[PDB]
Amino acid sequence: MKKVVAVVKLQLPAGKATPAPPVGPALGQHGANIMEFVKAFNAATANMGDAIVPVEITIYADRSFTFVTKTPPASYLIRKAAGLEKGAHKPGREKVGRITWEQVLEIAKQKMPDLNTTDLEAAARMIAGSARSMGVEVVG
Amino acid sequence: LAQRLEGLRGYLDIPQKETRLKELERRLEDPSLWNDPEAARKVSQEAARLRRTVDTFRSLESDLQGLLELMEELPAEEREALKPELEEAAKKLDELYHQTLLNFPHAEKNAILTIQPGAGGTEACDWAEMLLRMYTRFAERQGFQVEVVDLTPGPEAGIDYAQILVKGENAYGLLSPEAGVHRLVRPSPFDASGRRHTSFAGVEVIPEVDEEVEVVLKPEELRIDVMRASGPGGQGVNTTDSAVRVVHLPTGITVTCQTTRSQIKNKELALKILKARLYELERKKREEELKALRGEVRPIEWGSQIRSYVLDKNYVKDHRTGLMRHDPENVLDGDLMDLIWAGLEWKAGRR
RNA sequence: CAGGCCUUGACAUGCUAGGGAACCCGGGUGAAAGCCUGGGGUGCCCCGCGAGGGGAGCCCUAGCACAGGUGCUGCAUGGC
RNA sequence: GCCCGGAUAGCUCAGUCGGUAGAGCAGGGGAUUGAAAAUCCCCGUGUCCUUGGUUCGAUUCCGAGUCCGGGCACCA
Numbered sequence: 001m002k003k004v005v006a007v008v009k010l011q012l013p014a015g016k017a018t019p020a021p022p023v024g025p026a027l028g029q030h031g032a033n034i035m036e037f038v039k040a041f042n043a044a045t046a047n048m049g050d051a052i053v054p055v056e057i058t059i060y061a062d063r064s065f066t067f068v069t070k071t072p073p074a075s076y077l078i079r080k081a082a083g084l085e086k087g088a089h090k091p092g093r094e095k096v097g098r099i100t101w102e103q104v105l106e107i108a109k110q111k112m113p114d115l116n117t118t119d120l121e122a123a124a125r126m127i128a129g130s131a132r133s134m135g136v137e138v139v140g
Numbered sequence: 141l142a143q144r145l146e147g148l149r150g151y152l153d154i155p156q157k158e159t160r161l162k163e164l165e166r167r168l169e170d171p172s173l174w175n176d177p178e179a180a181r182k183v184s185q186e187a188a189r190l191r192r193t194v195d196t197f198r199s200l201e202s203d204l205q206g207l208l209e210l211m212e213e214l215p216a217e218e219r220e221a222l223k224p225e226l227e228e229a230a231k232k233l234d235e236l237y238h239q240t241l242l243n244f245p246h247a248e249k250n251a252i253l254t255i256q257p258g259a260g261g262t263e264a265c266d267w268a269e270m271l272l273r274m275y276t277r278f279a280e281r282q283g284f285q286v287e288v289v290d291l292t293p294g295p296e297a298g299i300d301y302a303q304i305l306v307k308g309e310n311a312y313g314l315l316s317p318e319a320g321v322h323r324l325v326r327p328s329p330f331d332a333s334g335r336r337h338t339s340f341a342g343v344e345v346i347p348e349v350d351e352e353v354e355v356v357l358k359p360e361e362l363r364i365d366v367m368r369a370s371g372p373g374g375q376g377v378n379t380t381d382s383a384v385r386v387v388h389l390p391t392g393i394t395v396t397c398q399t400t401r402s403q404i405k406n407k408e409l410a411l412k413i414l415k416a417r418l419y420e421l422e423r424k425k426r427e428e429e430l431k432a433l434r435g436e437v438r439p440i441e442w443g444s445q446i447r448s449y450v451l452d453k454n455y456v457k458d459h460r461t462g463l464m465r466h467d468p469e470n471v472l473d474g475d476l477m478d479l480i481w482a483g484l485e486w487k488a489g490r491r
Numbered sequence: 492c493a494g495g496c497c498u499u500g501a502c503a504u505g506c507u508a509g510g511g512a513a514c515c516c517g518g519g520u521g522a523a524a525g526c527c528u529g530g531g532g533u534g535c536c537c538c539g540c541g542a543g544g545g546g547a548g549c550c551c552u553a554g555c556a557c558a559g560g561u562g563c564u565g566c567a568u569g570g571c
Numbered sequence: 572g573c574c575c576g577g578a579u580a581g582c583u584c585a586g587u588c589g590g591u592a593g594a595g596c597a598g599g600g601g602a603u604u605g606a607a608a609a610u611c612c613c614c615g616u617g618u619c620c621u622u623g624g625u626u627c628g629a630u631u632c633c634g635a636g637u638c639c640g641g642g643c644a645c646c647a
Binding site (some may be wrong): 215 | 563
């Protein structure tokens with residue numbers, strides 16, 4: 001999130017990204033290019049590792065942009081702690097995963113910036129609501 | 141050796157569809173196309189079909205280079221530790237097969253096989269009697285379930301008509317290619333000299349789609365009229381609007397009744413007639429939409445064969461693909477997977 | 492048929508290379524097959540007592556031409 | 572729509588005062604013939620339409636419904 005009247009925030013793949021499948025053309029519809037965010041972009045994706053990369057865009061109408069990289073979405077960073085890939089067709093009380101108490105503080109060293117709280121406990125009770133969205137148990 | 145042909149059966153579809161995905165992925169990146177609610181959706185399904193054409197060409201160039209370089213047939217340490225790495229990556233090679241089998245408009249449901257004899261008379265029915273148990277073991281080996289809907293003998297020897305219903309998941313797609321006229325050439329047992337003779341027999345295949353029987357004509361599209369009765373009677377035939385005319389508006393058919401002297405018994409008697417004449421002209425279309433929906437290969441004549449079985453010189457000739465198998469007495473047991481594999485490539489390869 | 496293995500292959504001839512050239516006797520893992528591994532030591536043509544190797548039976552590893560088929564065709568055939 | 576009659580083996584038909592279910596054809600096994608048909612031996616074969624009642628108990632006797640075959644639907 002930035003400013004408005006011409007911006008788009010997506011969560012790119014990892015490794016390759018140039019075509020149109022993910023969101024490739026959606027940003028061209030609202031103004032974009034092919035030579036600015038493909039190779040002269042994957043400098044960060046080659047470093048961030050893999051999975052998903054919540055990097056966004058900001059249009060100016062002249063190939064300029066505020067390519068503010070972000071931290072992997074709390075939907076994926078949780079598949080790392082438990083293991084499952086999806087989460088659950090429908091959350092609730094049954095789920096194919098498990099996440100102990102300090103299991104949610106393992107990601108506290110990942111998500112720390114713009115969350116809102118600098119500390120670890122005033123920002124973990126936020127992801128505990130995300131542990132009732134995909135489903136992932138809280139071993140207690 | 142059973143891996144150089146299947147890895148290439150998706151290699152001819154690469155440039156045919158690869159150069160086509162570009163003149164389609166280059167229309168979405170321009171918003172000027174989105175002004176069409178449906179023409180921008182029609183372009184996004186074929187663009188979404190870049191999911192079976194941009195995933196396979198990714199997990200198919202690693203199964204041809206990561207296996208054909210350090211594969212010694214001499215028991216080693218890097219060879220039997222490399223077989224379980226491709227044993228579920230060759231058990232997965234069926235994912236590229238079912239994509240040319242599950243694409244029929246109705247290959248899921250159970251199928252219906254009609255094995256009818258043809259040219260060759262007395263012998264030709266023995267042929268259909270042999271092809272019947274040939275398809276019987278086949279659908280009993282794969283695991284499917286049989287229902288003999290009809291079987292009927294006849295005069296000398298063979299079989300007159302055989303109609304069977306075979307179930308199981310994706311059954312029609314498996315017995316759809318075996319739809320034609322199968323020729324046989326062998327020494328005639330019903331002859332004194334034993335001369336070499338030829339026999340023809342037809343095999344039809346049709347899935348089990350619709351089943352119910354209901355035509356509730358709600359009086360929503362009916363235009364009933366009440367004209368004054370005609371003929372005998374008295375003051376009452378002149379003055380009472382006895383005669384009635386039920387008019388079927390979405391069709392054009394009009395039935396009339398004047399048998400009785402009442403209107404409520406004549407419009408009801410005119411519906412016991414309109415329902416009848418409909419029950420024949422609404423089923424005549426389920427017989428005319430199904431007499432051109434089967435196909436065309438059924439002359440049974442000399443020159444319309446899909447596969448030839450000859451036990452004289454001992455071989456099987458698939459006239460569609462061109463193959464010549466040498467085990468005829470073995471194909472007559474149910475081993476059909478392979479010629480069905482090929483008939484589902486030759487058939488759905490021209491469309 | 493299911494399973495474990497062997498591929499110059501169980502056998503016939505012949506070629507090429509250093510092994511190796513009669514040869515007999517253990518151990519190990521495996522159900523067995525097979526793969527691994529431990530020893531005595533090879534008369535002989537014979538310059539030559541000899542260092543050596545020419546050496547014929549001839550066994551072992553590698554390579555080539557080949558071997559193998561109870562797979563089909565008894566209306567392709569012999570013979571019975 | 573009223574009045575009368577029926578459904579019983581796969582097919583066509585009989586039958587009991589209520590307690591016994593039968594005939595012909597089909598079908599299965601064997602036999603003959605080189606092999607078919609014909610012929611000969613050996614068998615099996617049913618909620619007696621469904622739904623209730625009386626009775627000690629109903630294929631049968633009454634009630635209801637569904638289907639079928641008929642006769643009736645006139646005077647103006």
